[PDB]
Amino acid sequence: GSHSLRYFSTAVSRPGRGEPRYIAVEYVDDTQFLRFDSDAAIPRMEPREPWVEQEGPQYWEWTTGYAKANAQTDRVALRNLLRRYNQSEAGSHTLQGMNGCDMGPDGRLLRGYHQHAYDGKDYISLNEDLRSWTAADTVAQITQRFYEAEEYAEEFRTYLEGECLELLRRYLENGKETLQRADPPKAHVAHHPISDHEATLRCWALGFYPAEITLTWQRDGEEQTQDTELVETRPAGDGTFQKWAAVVVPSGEEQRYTCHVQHEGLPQPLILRWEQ
């Protein structure tokens, strides 16, 4: 169905060891198609996916310098932002940033993403109107005034309006065998006896793309949400993910409980029972 195009940024300063570290990546949907690494040899924009390795040289230079300018801007922003609130230069600080757009099946824009954060906080973010931006700390509204002066919300509004649909459409067309796929999970139920007349059930959903998925245990149709245990979605390394959801059951009631899987790659949600 819908798809997304997002670019991150991260910069972490190293005191006394030389210039700050900078790394940034570009994800289309859940898969990163490019990388930029400052401290690695021959720094440039390196394609992370075969389908993007056939692009022309002007595009690769476009992405290399496109990443270089953002790198320097975030670097000096880390510099002058260090001294702004009360810190000696011996500290290691980090800044993060995010942008992108979301396209639907119709080919239009849903909601744009322009957000920036410093050292695990929120700094600035665009609104749903993509004109006024919300700030957080006392440092954030003065750069809010600078972004008001530049009127940047409309310019980046256009770049996320017409252009990122062309980038995302190009990637989806080149990566249709990857970007357009929907991988249904491989799911089963595991039974580990915990004690006498007590056990635990795990619901395993393996190898699914995208990462969005829902696992819900139910006894007799009623959800266990207070009693259920979830873990974060974890990558399998090829782009497929994994998740499990366990519930503690009294032994002998084993059959009352069923796991329910909801995923995009599935025609309809699934129900699973322990096989005995």
Partner: protein
């Protein structure tokens, strides 16, 4: 206001572990901050030299996550582990590979 966060550790193979079949071992470290993180993979406790990682990236909460992975062939005698250490974490943490699926 330096904040901090703490890494979340999961040790899992790609495919269901079956003795005598090529499979990668994965240690997925997430939920941590700042960016600098020291994580390791151990075969029977000793350092395994060849490792790779996913490109450094963060989630919607501005928390970094990495994935270290190393090819191997599973066998019942060899125990595997992951060894993580962070600024928040004091004594180096070790978690053992466990048979699940």
């Amino acid at each position: 206001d330096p904040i901090q966060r703490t890494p979340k550790i999961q040790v899992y193979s790609r495919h269901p572990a079956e003795n005598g079949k090529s499979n990668f071992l994965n240690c997925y470290v997430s939920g941590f901050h700042p960016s600098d993180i020291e994580v390791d993979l151990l075969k029977n406790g000793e350092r395994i030299e060849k490792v790779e990682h996913s490109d450094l990236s963060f989630s919607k909460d501005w928390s970094f996550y990495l994935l270290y992975y190393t090819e191997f062939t599973p066998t019942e005698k060899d125990e595997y582990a992951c060894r993580v250490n962070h600024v928040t974490l004091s004594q180096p943490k070790i978690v053992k590979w466990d048979r699940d699926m």
